[PDB]
Amino acid sequence: QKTLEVWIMPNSPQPAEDFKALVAPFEKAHGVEVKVTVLDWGVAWTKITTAATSGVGPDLTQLGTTWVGAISAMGVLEPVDDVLEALGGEKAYLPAVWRTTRLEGARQATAVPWFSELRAFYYRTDALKAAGVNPAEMFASWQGFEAGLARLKASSFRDPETKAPLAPLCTPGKNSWDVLHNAAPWIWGAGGEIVRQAGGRWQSALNSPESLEGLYFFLSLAQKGYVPAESLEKNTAQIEADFQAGKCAVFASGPWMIQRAQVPEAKGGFAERTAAKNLGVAPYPAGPKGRYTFFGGSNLALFNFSKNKPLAKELLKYLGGPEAQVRYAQMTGMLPALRSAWSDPSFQQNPLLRTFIQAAQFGRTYPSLAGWGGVENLAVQHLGMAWDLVAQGRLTREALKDLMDKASAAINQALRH
Amino acid sequence: KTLEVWIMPNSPQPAEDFKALVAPFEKAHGVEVKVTVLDWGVAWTKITTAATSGVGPDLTQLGTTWVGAISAMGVLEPVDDVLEALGGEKAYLPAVWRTTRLEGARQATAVPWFSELRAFYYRTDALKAAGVNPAEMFASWQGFEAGLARLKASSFRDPETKAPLAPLCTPGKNSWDVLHNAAPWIWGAGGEIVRQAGGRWQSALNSPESLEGLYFFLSLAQKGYVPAESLEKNTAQIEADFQAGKCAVFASGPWMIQRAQVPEGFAERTAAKNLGVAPYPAGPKGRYTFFGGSNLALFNFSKNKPLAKELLKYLGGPEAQVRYAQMTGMLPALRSAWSDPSFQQNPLLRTFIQAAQFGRTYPSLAGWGGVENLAVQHLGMAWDLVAQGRLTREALKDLMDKASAAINQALRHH
Ligand SMILES: OC[C@H]1O[C@@H](O[C@H]2[C@H](O)[C@@H](O)[C@H](O[C@H]3[C@H](O)[C@@H](O)[C@H](O[C@H]4[C@H](O)[C@@H](O)[C@H](O)O[C@@H]4CO)O[C@@H]3CO)O[C@@H]2CO)[C@H](O)[C@@H](O)[C@@H]1O
Ligand SMILES: OC[C@H]1O[C@@H](O[C@H]2[C@H](O)[C@@H](O)[C@H](O[C@H]3[C@H](O)[C@@H](O)[C@H](O[C@H]4[C@H](O)[C@@H](O)[C@H](O)O[C@@H]4CO)O[C@@H]3CO)O[C@@H]2CO)[C@H](O)[C@@H](O)[C@@H]1O
Ligand SMILES: O=S([O-])[O-]
Ligand SMILES: O=S([O-])[O-]
Ligand SMILES: [Cl-]
Ligand SMILES: [Cl-]
Ligand SMILES: [Cl-]
Ligand SMILES: [Cl-]
Ligand SMILES: [Cl-]
């Protein structure tokens, strides 16, 4: 009889099945069936907001860290200060992860940390070696990054399976939330930001001089032919598929690709591909105002309209606790959200992962604002049109400025309600 | 003794629904059929990488428009034997039989799995409140534009969202449907995606009639009938926007009827309780909708060809044909199964079946996968002309000239 409904995004090679295995010990102890529904990231904002506005939906949903404020501000999440206390309270979490548990300025936590992830560059070891590129120099600075992409463009290296050259850099130009998360380090590296506090409200800083310098440098990589035209119409899954297929020398992603590299295609990885045997990781290069990468992850939230709140909170404590934290990070290739869980050998013994753990020092998060879901939709949409300027041969500083002005007007409307 | 099959997301729980479909075959033969689900956006990359590498599943789902392109690479096992075991050419609609091969090829290289074609879902409640007659809105282009204008002016608000509905939502980016949704407007104007000229196939997207059809469609967004936000979204996002009650009208296949009668499906939503279907309107020169579906193909590097062929006969066979169509909401590929009472009884589905009369598809060419990538990319930039307020006849012509140059290259080679 007793059931729970949980919504997750595709975090692991076999999302529903892996989640079912993760919760099996809880299901057997409590005599509960946890039903899981997988929502792709592209529809997850629409589906979660429609649950919020309708009052009908699951007991628990996965919430991207950048959406916790936005859904909390709709008044639909259960406070979970009790669960967080039971898991060790504020000390049990990195400060950046603890801020993701609530809407900025709220007294009560409305989400439990589930997993963490941050961005770095995967590269083809074989492709950089053949081009004569030193990883240490290419990922040190913006100048080094561009110097390496130039050598990768000139290289006569061809993928062993494709028999064709690799694009130096692939990056998604449409649909994905990653259209923003992939731009943010460039913006931040130049001394810009997505938003700023002015007149005791938040507003867009995407049309600030330093935000435009960072974004213009990133887009100019495609204008200089380091990113293929075709990339600029693709989403995150398509660029990941292009790297697996041996079409791209370099791309930005999270630590999950290390796990996908070790698993056959049948089970949702790319162990059969050349890229899997030729996998390097390097941090984002320092920009003129320092080194930054996107730090995020996902939390778990309980709808305050749930019929099963005590049992749902027992599942939250289980999923946020040390055993399930290590197990899900092993299955997904994410990092645990719980600080303690980072010391497991699965994480400390993993050399590509150690690059991500070290890169966390330069990790940066968006403020946890009401309206952030709106900011991300509008940013993805307007940055997507910035990539179109490149494809159309219309990228100039003034055209980017006029487009980020439009972006900033729409974003400011979403932040003011 | 094992088979690997790659499928696309055809049903609400793709792997689980597939595993239940094959469980009776697994028990008859003592075999495990392992299934891997590939999203449509990555399925062309993954299938072509299998073809070029010599490494992949035993069977793959192949969208009908890709059968020629994968067949041309010489990687598919001939399956005329399976098709004979299922009754041969007479056991299939001619349009479905076309998709079993590269155009002009001697041997069949794919087995028909399911069929789908496009029509318009609409909110019965939204059109009633706007004073729009569905039969008149979906009869002609003038009716279609007149109806969208009434839907734009309407004061109707979704009961759950308490907000107005977009008249029309259509995906502007990423999905293959960016082409399949443009094609009926192109075709209705007397145009086409490609034509045979000078001994070759080439793009006809810059032909005068193709530009009139395409400009009419795009001008629906220029007139405020499609929200700017839609023009940056993909098929799943538009489907989610309709389910959430944000769109009065959208183009889709028969699978949404099945999604509409299943819980979180979207049975609980206002859109499911107020759901109509109407065929594509007649255009000036003709009345057309996209007709497609998916076949199953066997890689000639499979180590299990005899067992794989037994799975193909099972999946293409009457029992599995009906059961998979019931689980997915697609139409059976097998001629027989269109007449099964389960399909006949369903009034929204009867609309799809009878709309098959106007069904058209692309010729089965080598390089069609590349044509679809390039078409989606260039049409995506046509939608951007609208979002940027730069849509003119000349800017569209310039863009489809570029599209045609890139497409003509893709019809020659990768
Ligand atoms: O802004 C929202 C939220 O973003 C979180 O970051 C997400 C990215 O949004 C997401 O794109 C990223 O990558 C996903 C990707 O979208 C999926 O397409 C992909 O699917 C894989 C999957 O791994 C397998 O099941 C399947 O078989 O293969 C496909 C590839 O075709 O999976 C990846 C990884 O999940 O994931 C990011 C992290 O979840 C931020 O973390 C958060 O802070 C933001 O709030
Ligand atoms: O051109 C290639 C090929 O296309 C075939 O048509 C496909 C369309 O490409 C496809 O977009 C269409 O819609 C899919 C949609 O893309 C998926 O995103 C969606 O996924 C569902 C899923 O089934 C559920 O499990 C999940 O919970 O929700 C998502 C929605 O968020 O499913 C629909 C329907 O499968 O489907 C078309 C039919 O397969 C043509 O048929 C073919 O001829 C062409 O060769
Ligand atoms: O690979 S699973 O079917 O055992
Ligand atoms: O179209 S390429 O990305 O497979
Ligand atoms: Cl910021
Ligand atoms: Cl705008
Ligand atoms: Cl055509
Ligand atoms: Cl004009
Ligand atoms: Cl030409």
Name B116's bridge partners: B292
The residue with tokens 């107020």 is B274
Residue (of A199, A127, A241, A207) closest to A383 by Cα position: A207
In the chain, the amino acid numbered B40 is W
Crossing angle (nearest 10°) for helices B177-188 and B208-222: 120
Residue (of A120, A72, A82, A116) closest to A98 by Cα position: A116
Distance of alpha carbon A259 from alpha carbon B355, whole angstroms: 47
Chain A contacts of B16, Cβ < 8 Å? Answer: 16
Centroid of chain to Cα A149 = 23
Chain B contacts of A49, Cβ < 8 Å? Answer: 244
Please judge whether B376 and A233 are an interchain contact, meaning their C-beta atoms are less than 8 angstroms apart.
Answer: yes
| Ligand 4 pocket, mutate which of A159, A234, A242, A248 (most atoms under 8 A from CB) | A242
Interface mutation target, options B11, B173, B259, chain A, most CBs of A under 10 Å = B173
| Angle, CA of A353, A45 and A342, to the nearest 5° | 20
Distance of alpha carbon B30 from alpha carbon B27, whole angstroms: 5
Are B177 and B295 part of one and the same domain? no
Distance of alpha carbon A68 from alpha carbon B244, whole angstroms: 21
Instruction: Please report the sign of the dihedral spanned by the C-alpha atoms of residue A181, residue A186, residue A191, residue A192.
Output: negative
Give the pairing of strands B111-117 and A335-336.
unpaired
Instruction: Please report the sign of the dihedral spanned by the C-alpha atoms of residue A272, residue A277, residue A278, residue A280.
Output: positive
* Residue B111, φ and ψ in degrees, nearest 5: -105, 125
**Distance from the first to the final alpha carbon of chain A:** 42
Chain B contacts of A57, Cβ < 8 Å? Answer: 264
With a CB cutoff of 8 Å and minimum separation 6, the contacts of B100 are B67, B79, B83, B92, B108, B109, B110, B111, B112, B295
Dihedral of the CA atoms B185, B221, B255, B101 (nearest 10)?
A: 40
Six token digits for residue B205: 């997207």
Are B264 and B297 part of one and the same domain? no
Interface mutation target, options B16, B160, B174, chain A, most CBs of A under 10 Å = B174
Are B239 and B358 part of one and the same domain? no
Residue (of A303, A318, A300, A301) closest to A87 by Cα position: A318
Can you give the resolution of this entry in Å? 2.0
Ligand 1 atom closest to A100 (CA)? 43
Crossing angle (nearest 10°) for helices A15-30 and B14-29: 80
Nearest CA to ligand 4 atom 2: B45
Chain B contacts of A14, Cβ < 8 Å? Answer: 15
Size of interface A-B (CB pairs under 8 A): 109
Residue (of A260, A39, A49, A19) closest to B13 by Cα position: A39
Are B122 and B80 part of one and the same domain? no
Six token digits for residue A311: 């049992």
State in Å: Cα B178 to ligand 1 middle.
23
Neighbour-count burial of B13, counting CB atoms closer than 10 A to its CB (0-12 exposed, 13-18 middle, 19+ buried): middle
Distance of alpha carbon B16 from alpha carbon B267, whole angstroms: 20
Chain A contacts of B406, Cβ < 8 Å? Answer: none
| Ligand 1 pocket, mutate which of A177, A356, A365 (most atoms under 8 A from CB) | A177
* 3-class SS string, A230-258: HHHHCCHHHHHHHHHCCCEEEEEECCHHH
- Selecting from A14, A175, A241 the residue whose C-beta is nearest the C-beta of B42 gives A241
State in Å: Cα B41 to ligand 4 middle.
9
Q: Give, in order, the Cα–Cα distances in Å from A232 to each of A48, B100, B227.
A: 28, 34, 22
Plot region of B367 (φ>0 → left; ψ -120 to 50 → alpha; else → beta): left
Q: Is B300 in the pocket of ligand 4 (CB under 6 A)?
A: no
Domain count, chain B: 2
Are A247 and A324 part of one and the same domain? no
* Residue A96, φ and ψ in degrees, nearest 5: -55, -40
Please judge whether A47 and B240 are an interchain contact, meaning their C-beta atoms are less than 8 angstroms apart.
Answer: yes
Per-chain residues with Cβ under 5 A from ion ligand 9: B 408
Q: Is A236 in the pocket of ligand 1 (CB under 6 A)?
A: yes
- Selecting from B55, B161, B373 the residue whose C-beta is nearest the C-beta of A272 gives B55
In the chain, the amino acid numbered A158 is R
Distance of alpha carbon A104 from alpha carbon B4, whole angstroms: 48
To the nearest whole Å, the CA of A175 is away from the closest chain B CA by 7
State in Å: Cα B34 to ligand 3 middle.
7
State in Å: Cα B186 to ligand 7 middle.
9
Chain B contacts of A233, Cβ < 8 Å? Answer: 173-174, 376-377, 380
Report yes or no: A177 and A194 within 8 Å, Cβ to Cβ. no
| Angle, CA of B372, B374 and B377, to the nearest 5° | 105
To the nearest whole Å, the CA of B244 is away from the closest chain A CA by 6
Are A90 and A125 part of one and the same domain? no
Domain extent at residue B129 = 118-289+365-414
* Residue B76, φ and ψ in degrees, nearest 5: -105, 135
Chain A contacts of B173, Cβ < 8 Å? Answer: 174-175, 233, 384
| Angle, CA of A411, A412 and A416, to the nearest 5° | 120
Q: Give, in order, the Cα–Cα distances in Å from A183 to each of A180, A192, A217, B178.
A: 5, 11, 10, 26
Plot region of A57 (φ>0 → left; ψ -120 to 50 → alpha; else → beta): left
Please judge whether B243 and A392 are an interchain contact, meaning their C-beta atoms are less than 8 angstroms apart.
Answer: no
To the nearest whole Å, the CA of B285 is away from the closest chain A CA by 32
Are B317 and B355 part of one and the same domain? yes
Distance of alpha carbon A173 from alpha carbon A234, whole angstroms: 6
Report yes or no: B297 and B62 within 8 Å, Cβ to Cβ. yes
Please judge whether B232 and A265 are an interchain contact, meaning their C-beta atoms are less than 8 angstroms apart.
Answer: no
State in Å: Cα B227 to ligand 6 middle.
11
Are A286 and A142 part of one and the same domain? yes
Crossing angle (nearest 10°) for helices A397-416 and A209-223: 130
Report yes or no: B253 and B294 within 8 Å, Cβ to Cβ. no
Name A250's bridge partners: A123, A169
Ligand 2 atom closest to B293 (CA)? 41
Nearest CA to ligand 2 atom 9: B176
* Half-sphere exposure of residue A232: CA atoms within 13 angstroms, side-chain side: 26
**Chain B residue with minimal CA distance to A163?**
B52
To the nearest whole Å, the CA of A291 is away from the closest chain B CA by 31
* 3-class SS string, chain A: CCEEEEEECCCCCCHHHHHHHHHHHHHHHHCCEEEEEECCHHHHHHHHHHHHHHCCCCCEEEEEHHHHHHHHCCCCECCCHHHHHHCCHHHHCCHHHHHCCCCCCCCCCCCEEEEEEECEEEEEHHHHHHHCCCHHHHCCEHHHHHHHHHHHHHCCCCCCCCCCCCEEECCCCCCCCHHHHHHHHHHHHCCCCCEEEECCEEEECCCCHHHHHHHHHHHHHHHCCCCCHHHHHCCHHHHHHHHHCCCEEEEEECCHHHHHHCCCHHHCCCCCCHHHHCEEEECCCEECCECCEEEEEEEEEEECCCCCHHHHHHHHHHHHCHHHHHHHHHHHCCEECCHHHHHCHHHHCCHHHHHHHHHHHHEECCCCCCCHHHHHHHHHHHHHHHHHHHHCCCCCHHHHHHHHHHHHHHHHHHHHC
Give the pairing of strands B359-360 and B289-298.
parallel
Are B167 and B148 part of one and the same domain? yes
Interface mutation target, options B175, B233, B386, B413, chain A, most CBs of A under 10 Å = B233
* 3-class SS string, chain B: CEEEEEECCCCCCHHHHHHHHHHHHHHHHCCEEEEEECCHHHHHHHHHHHHHHCCCCCEEEEEHHHHHHHHHCCCECCCHHHHHHCCHHHHCCHHHHHCCCCCCCCCCCCEEEEEEECEEEEEHHHHHHHCCCHHHHCCEHHHHHHHHHHHHHCCCCCCCCCCCCEEECCCCCCCCHHHHHHHHHHHHCCCCCEEEECCEEEECCCCHHHHHHHHHHHHHHHCCCCCHHHHHCCHHHHHHHHHCCCEEEEEECCHHHHHHCCCCCCCCCHHHHCEEEECCCECCCCCCEEEEEEEEEEECCCCCHHHHHHHHHHHHCHHHHHHHHHHHCCEECCHHHHCCHHHHCCHHHHHHHHHHHHEECCCCCCCHHHHHHHHHHHHHHHHHHHHCCCCCHHHHHHHHHHHHHHHHHHHHCC
Distance of alpha carbon B41 from alpha carbon A42, whole angstroms: 12
Are A307 and A390 part of one and the same domain? no
Residue (of A386, A368, A380) closest to A410 by Cα position: A380
Question: Which among B364, B388, B405 is the end of a domain?
Answer: B364
* Half-sphere exposure of residue A132: CA atoms within 13 angstroms, side-chain side: 6
Ligand 1 atom closest to A117 (CA)? 41
- Determination method here? X-ray
Neighbour-count burial of A416, counting CB atoms closer than 10 A to its CB (0-12 exposed, 13-18 middle, 19+ buried): exposed
Residue (of A177, A216, A213) closest to A192 by Cα position: A213
Centroid of chain to Cα A21 = 24
Six token digits for residue A187: 């913006």
Are B312 and B172 part of one and the same domain? no
Buried b (16+ CB within 10 A) or exposed e, B331-350: bbbbbebbebeebeebebbe
Distance of alpha carbon A205 from alpha carbon A193, whole angstroms: 6
Q: Is B52 in the pocket of ligand 4 (CB under 6 A)?
A: no
Q: Is A42 in the pocket of ligand 1 (CB under 6 A)?
A: no
Are B135 and B113 part of one and the same domain? no
Centroid of chain to Cα A118 = 7
Distance of alpha carbon A320 from alpha carbon A323, whole angstroms: 9
Chain A contacts of B245, Cβ < 8 Å? Answer: 50
**Chain A residue with minimal CA distance to B270?**
A54
* Residue B389, φ and ψ in degrees, nearest 5: 65, 30
State in Å: Cα B48 to ligand 5 middle.
40
The residue with tokens 């290419």 is A138
Q: Is A298 in the pocket of ligand 1 (CB under 6 A)?
A: yes
How many CB atoms lie under 10 A from the CB of residue A277?
12
